[PDB]
Amino acid sequence: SQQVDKIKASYPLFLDQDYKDMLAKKRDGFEEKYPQDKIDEVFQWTTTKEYQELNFQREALTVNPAKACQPLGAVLCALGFEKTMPYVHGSQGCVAYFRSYFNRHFREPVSCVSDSMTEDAAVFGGQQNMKDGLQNCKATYKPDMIAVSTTCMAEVIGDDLNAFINNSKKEGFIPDEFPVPFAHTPSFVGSHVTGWDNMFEGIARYFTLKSMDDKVVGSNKKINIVPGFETYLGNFRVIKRMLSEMGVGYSLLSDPEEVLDTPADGQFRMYAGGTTQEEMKDAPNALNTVLLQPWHLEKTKKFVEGTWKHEVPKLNIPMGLDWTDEFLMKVSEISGQPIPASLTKERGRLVDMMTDSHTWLHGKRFALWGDPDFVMGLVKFLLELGCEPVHILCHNGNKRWKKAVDAILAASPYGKNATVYIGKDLWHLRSLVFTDKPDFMIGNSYGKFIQRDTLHKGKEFEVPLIRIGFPIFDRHHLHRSTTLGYEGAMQILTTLVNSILERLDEETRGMQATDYNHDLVR
Amino acid sequence: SQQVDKIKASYPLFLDQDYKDMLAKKRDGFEEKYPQDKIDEVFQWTTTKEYQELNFQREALTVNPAKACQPLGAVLCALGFEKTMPYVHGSQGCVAYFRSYFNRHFREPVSCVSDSMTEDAAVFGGQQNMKDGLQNCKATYKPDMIAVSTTCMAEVIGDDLNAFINNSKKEGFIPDEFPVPFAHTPSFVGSHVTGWDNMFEGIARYFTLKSMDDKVVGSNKKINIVPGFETYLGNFRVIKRMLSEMGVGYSLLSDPEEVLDTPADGQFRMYAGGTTQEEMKDAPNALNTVLLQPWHLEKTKKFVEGTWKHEVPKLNIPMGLDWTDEFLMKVSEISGQPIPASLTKERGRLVDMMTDSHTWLHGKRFALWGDPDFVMGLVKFLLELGCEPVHILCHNGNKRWKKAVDAILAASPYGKNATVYIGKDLWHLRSLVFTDKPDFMIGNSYGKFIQRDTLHKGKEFEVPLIRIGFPIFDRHHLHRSTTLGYEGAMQILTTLVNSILERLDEETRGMQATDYNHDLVR
Amino acid sequence: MSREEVESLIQEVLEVYPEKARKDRNKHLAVNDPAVTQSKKCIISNKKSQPGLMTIRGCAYAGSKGVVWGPIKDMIHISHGPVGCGQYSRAGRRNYYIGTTGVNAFVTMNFTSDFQEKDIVFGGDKKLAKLIDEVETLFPLNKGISVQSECPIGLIGDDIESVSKVKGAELSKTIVPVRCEGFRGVSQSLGHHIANDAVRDWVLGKRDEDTTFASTPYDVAIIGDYNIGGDAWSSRILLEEMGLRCVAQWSGDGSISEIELTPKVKLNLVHCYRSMNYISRHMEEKYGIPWMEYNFFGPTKTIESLRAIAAKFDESIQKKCEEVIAKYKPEWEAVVAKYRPRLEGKRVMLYIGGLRPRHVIGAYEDLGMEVVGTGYEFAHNDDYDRTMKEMGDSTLLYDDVTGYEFEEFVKRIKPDLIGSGIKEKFIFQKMGIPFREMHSWDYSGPYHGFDGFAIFARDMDMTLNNPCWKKLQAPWE
Amino acid sequence: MSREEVESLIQEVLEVYPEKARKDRNKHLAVNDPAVTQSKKCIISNKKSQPGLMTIRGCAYAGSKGVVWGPIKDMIHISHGPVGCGQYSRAGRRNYYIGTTGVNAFVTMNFTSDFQEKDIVFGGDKKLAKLIDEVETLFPLNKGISVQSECPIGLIGDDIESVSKVKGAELSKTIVPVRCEGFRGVSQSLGHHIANDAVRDWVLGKRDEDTTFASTPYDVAIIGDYNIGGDAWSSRILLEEMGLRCVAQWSGDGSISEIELTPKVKLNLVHCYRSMNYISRHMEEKYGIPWMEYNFFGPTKTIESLRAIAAKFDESIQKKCEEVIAKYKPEWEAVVAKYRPRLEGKRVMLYIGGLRPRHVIGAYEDLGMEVVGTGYEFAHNDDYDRTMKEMGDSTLLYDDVTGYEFEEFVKRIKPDLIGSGIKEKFIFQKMGIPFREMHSWDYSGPYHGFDGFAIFARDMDMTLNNPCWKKLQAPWE
Ligand code: ICS
Ligand code: CLF
Ligand code: CLF
Ligand SMILES: [Fe+3]
Ligand SMILES: [Fe+3]
């Protein structure tokens, strides 16, 4: 039953007595459900250390992973170039899933095409698919560039992208001068950040490998900036702003922030902004190339150092205080530009915020997960604040990255209780938060279920989630935030301290029970 | 007892069994407390409509007001001028309270002095106090200007500020050319915003009234901006940024954002930034004067229109889409500068966010309180989002303001259920949230107690608080936010929708009870 | 109206395509004629997409794992292959259920074999057996395992059927291998077919020799309702108020025991014909259970469906049906009185997967709204036979529409509202057209039954009449 | 350190003042000598502030309403005058209590008469009577009303005593008029005196003729502890473990009935001598109740105070005292072992109100910390008599220090830590010096007793050794 003045959605309409009786009748009559005491016993068992020992013995089963596949990152990289269509050679279901994922994270249109390979191509290959798809895509959406990646379907049969695109150009399906860079992005290797690296290396090779004779290093007085896989528009914005404030010439390669932040004014813009082909062709003439996320740009680094002959600096991600300082001084040394007073004042203001909130931050325990560079920057910032990272998880990290993270942890007195896990999923993380309870979790939206599980054990066992990372599906417009530089450090610090204070406020709201500590001033 | 590995603060150490038994023994033995059933009965009675009828009959008793006194606003206005010392003629306890209030809100040093008037001056007057105080303040802190306001003590004894400052200058306590503007700020009249208006009018009069002969309107091709009482640094920043993006010459009068955001770099800066004396002397040469918060700048408007002969536009606070658009078009008309494409894109991006979040925003009910201009801007923005203001409270508002707010509400179909209250405090608001429950409250930190009360009635009766306004004491660095322009509208929209989504997440976290609606994608 | 204008618009839109693509797409766009009963002479459906044209269709894995098998709550469903597919489909579909997640329900969790290069080169059958052992160890209260294949499984030559048989014999558990690889078929439809075949072959006939279930003449099953936003629940209550007994519910909030008890009921009530016609026809042929379609969208269709169902039983059921209709009449009458004045005369354009483009017309007309264009991602020709009679004269019909076509048709027709999925929402929102999600209900619902009609009307009004649609043009432009 | 250097620093700081201000401030700064017993020969205290010099002192209203009367939970305290004073003092002080706010406790609530121009011109006694009627109507479970005066009340000819007498006779309720106007006195200490006089005249003698309260030889009262962060509670438990009975505590978590039962106890335990010496001396003179000071800051002071208290009673109390000390020894020994290595050798400067500058020294020395400078806002000369023997040789002593003086002293001395209030915290934080709030405990605590010592040590370590103090200089500067 519904009252027209106050209509109820699924919650809380299904909490009415008639719906509850219907559900109880259904369960008791036809579901053959386990007794509730058995379910409670099994849940309590899954919260124990013996279950954790069994859980970490897993070798073949993955439960709730924290990574995606390569062509998603390839699509994100392709979206960062001017009037460029991402084109995935393979099956259409992959493109549907990629577009849905990015639509839900960014709340914006995401453009990508497929050549729709089927079992016929599974026998004969997808050459005709590529010819027809390139012709149709160019005719219909009029891109200046088509960036080709692959699905696991096309990877397994071993489709030769170079030969297929060459045959497409030779037989007149697309003009010979039309740019079609390509990259093999096998989804059973690495993760989405690996796909971003592969696609960027393919585009850079396509535009620079054969025309390196007239390239002189430092001729255009610019610094190349490669961001890597990034899902915060504020990060692109802050990098560009900081470089402009120093008066430093720069070229951001794969810049998608315009195409992911188009205005609503009555028209649809399929393309907006992005790195131009002239910038990519002129990139070898820069003074140097800076890689913002170097732990998933190894192929790009190898290409830039070997071919462009750029002495790429050994820089960490500019997250937190020390690494932002190091990035700024390295950029100043490369370009010869002094660091302006505005950035000095911004750094001092961040330090002032740290001094203001150190009392509420000190000693707090965090579990956290995400991508390797983001994770290590977060760990560095948390150590700088006096916080205790305890469970550090990165599903797509490797052993060298783990060694570097351990070196970071050992240098700080606050890293003595920290453990780094590589190749572990979020069911492992659920076991960890149950057996060694932290104060908070930092991660993407998939952590919300873990919180639910903790709340099932008891209110004193709940581990609240702070949403920093990718993807965030249950909050609006968080993708506009910043995690890089002093501004990103300020945003992260504000979020952390205010999460702590809301938790304390919730825990002390009981009248005549705990509200003696419900302070007006905190 | 304390465990050295996990030490407990007041919460939750006082929840131990020994402390609980001690407290129970104390209450049962020596407090003569009412029976718990009597307390529960009285609380339930205070949540009823009969209690509300009794509560709104109050004529002489104020309970939990939502305003401060004039000299606080006078101090805030004085802080916005270059190397200016706020000087309150009166009692020193007032200055101690003002400084503590601003320290807790801004988490920054706040500089103010008093002449420390005592029982002796209660019969003789504070003439010697002013002479000695002006001399000591100038000698010790070396200001370029001393801005004098008053406490209720000196107002009641009828101290003549003009004569006392003139006698101080004549007898050599301070140089005749040293600027000492003054304002009478009786605390039993108006509120802190009235004090801001009075102090600004006093400073402007001091610097411009006697030298108007050589002033020609429009000579410097600038627009004067008067912000009024403002406690968000982002508001000053966004006004300056928007005016600079249009290429519009401007002069912001009383700008304290530099002195309230000093960096932590090893030195203490008593003064930082602010409006210069040259700007204030040249203000009559502007094209026009724009008042950002016109409902507490009536004296300033009268002075600027009568003396400077500036045709001050009739503009609302630039809050939300329509009023930001109107402010931008009025500035464009005054200065002759076209509105740039960057601001058009920012407006479109705000509209895009509104389109994305309208589903979760529609039909939501808000109680809200604050200062008049802030409150009407909030009401306008909430109406633009399809939300329902229901209880609109402004303790320091008047009848003309209420008529204007009612005219705003009548123009929108979402204003049907809204009521405007002037001269009512937060105990009235507590009665209102109990008897006609809204979804959320918007206000300063004093609302937190109301939430506690609602939680005492039952979880289904809790009204969560969203902290927008002044002062915010229980959260860190919220004073850095923005409420003006498209950027402020985006911040407010993000906060509102995410508050709604956290409430929904909390309400659907019960495993096998309500977590059927615990959606990953919202 | 204006059929000639619609055909001219079709020609103008098709003018941009290359010859092959234009010739193919010309067969998938049509101008409706309600008098036409054969769609094969009007429109062509269920064909492969043209490459590089930004289709909306998914794959057979989405049609099997995401649609049919995923809502089964007491089973663990394992994405066999690389990590991407199960991650993108995890909790993306709002099939509601009751259970303790991680203990006895596993709907929102992602189980996968997470293939690496070594698994591709040397196969993944041993990994599959080890993974099944680990699943049995860590999730004891599970009641059956399904193995949903991704593309490499079908491409490398893995024998999941042998592994399923051996491990099912070993553990005495039902293990269902589903060969729902992505490259088979042209859309999710073959996923529906393959999943139904797996249900028939591995689950449906488990209690053929079991006769301990007491049966009543009023036993029905709900087939093809996936409990989106609670939709199936909002239907089931009405059927229980009529006096029927709902034994199973396929497959939203569904348990494997309900599926196994389905062959014991007296009637099948099919909501989604497209995804469950296979299994309903099989049970009619094998067990003799009649099946009938029903539509619980809007008061008119709900009342007609309730009367049609009650006619299949005796007079007591018919009396209860009349009582239910009388009880619910004032509520939907109040909803209509409140919301029809705000929604009368508006024009709607729809593009959904395989059942909803035609099922929702009645609810829209119950609020005075006219549907001027509709289309299907993957539905067959019988779906268009059913659709053509429900739509108006000279309305637009599109099959597997491309993004460019959808955009141009909306630009020419200018509807007041569009109902489509996640990948067209923001496209049409930046155009200034109100948009409602017709797959997930925009995280609202349910929309079925009388209780769902109120939510439907409120959502239509709140999106169509929102002030933000009048603010897209800057006042200085 | 190096007395001649400290005197030179004092002269250099004073060089900037005008002759009158310099001559006045010269009497309020001193170099401590522990051998000196009388402070009148070295330092001058309890005098009016120099105008325009940024004093830290408050007013008598703060000393009466905010310190003494405000913590009383079952009373309603009414700020008579304009709106500002009660708003700035609302919930600014962390006097903890147990109660249902708005029903039977009113500590964090702000009751005021909210004077307007009309009230100033024509008085506010009628408004006061009407407001008392309204209070009685809307808050029935209140147990007494106090009326705290602000500056205009004393400035205009208002007579709150007559209103209080008439309304108390009419309603049979205790109404206490407090003439704590701001301009009286030089600081909050006259507020303490006035509030104590009001307590004596209007509350303390209610049950002089009542003898229904059963008394024991082990009856004590806690006087001058305001339960900051729970401090009084952390003290009370220890006294109950000794076997004593705490009949009242003034005034944190205090009730009016406890105040009226205070004249029935056997001993008064005075924590803050400065704010309660008046009432303790009055009860000694009138009821013959002895009073003694105690210090529960740090294990050493706590143990000495417990033994001194137990010596006032018979042998069973002393046996229980030894039992309590033995029980608590391992815990504070563990705290010392953990935190002393991180805090040994550090130098501390303090500027607090009337009691804490000398009380906290022992706890600091219990962790290996030396206090090199200390000072008072409003304390009297006997407080300095205690402080001078409490502190070390050649340390700095300051009374009613100005902001400029304190900044210059801190620049010259360079302490590792500073403990002061809200108005110096950020000044010294931007300077790069660790700062702890010594009024509110930086929203931490309690710090009294053994359980409070652990919190004290953890807070000292967490602020002194925080990494942010090593990051104030940019690497490029
Ligand atoms: S009452 Fe006094 S200023 Fe003795 S007015 Fe002040 S809660 Fe201080 S040094 Mo705030 S004489 Fe208490 C005090 Fe000491 S408010 Fe507290 S900390 S022990
Ligand atoms: S059509 Fe369908 S969704 Fe596509 S793969 Fe095939 S079953 Fe799956 Fe998962 S991992 Fe990524 S998304 Fe593909 S490319 Fe390899
Ligand atoms: S010394 Fe003390 S705090 Fe000062 S007034 Fe006097 S009692 Fe009060 Fe309240 S209202 Fe404002 S702050 Fe004053 S000026 Fe009139
Ligand atoms: Fe958007
Ligand atoms: Fe600060």
Residue numbers in the entry:
A (entry chain D), B (entry chain B): 2 to 523
C (entry chain C), D (entry chain A): 4 to 480
Could you give the paper's own sentences about this structure?
Demonstrating the utility of this workflow, we determined high-resolution cryoEM structures of deoxygenated human hemoglobin (Hb) in various liganded states and the molybdenum-iron protein (MoFeP) – the O2-sensitive catalytic component of Azotobacter vinelandii nitrogenase – in a reduced state.
Using our chameleon protocol, we prepared grids of MoFeP and obtained a 2.39-Å resolution structure. As expected from previous studies of nitrogenase under conditions of O2 exposure, we did not see any obvious changes or damage to FeMoco, but an inspection of the EM density around the P-cluster suggested that it was in the 2-electron oxidized P2+ state, indicating O2 perfusion through the sample and oxidation of the P-cluster from the PN reduced state to P2+. However, the P-cluster is also highly sensitive to O2 exposure and is rapidly oxidized under aerobic conditions, that results in significant alterations to the metal cluster geometry and coordination. Both of these linkages are present in our aerobically-prepared MoFeP structure, confirming oxidation of the P-clusters to the P2+ state following O2 exposure during grid preparation.
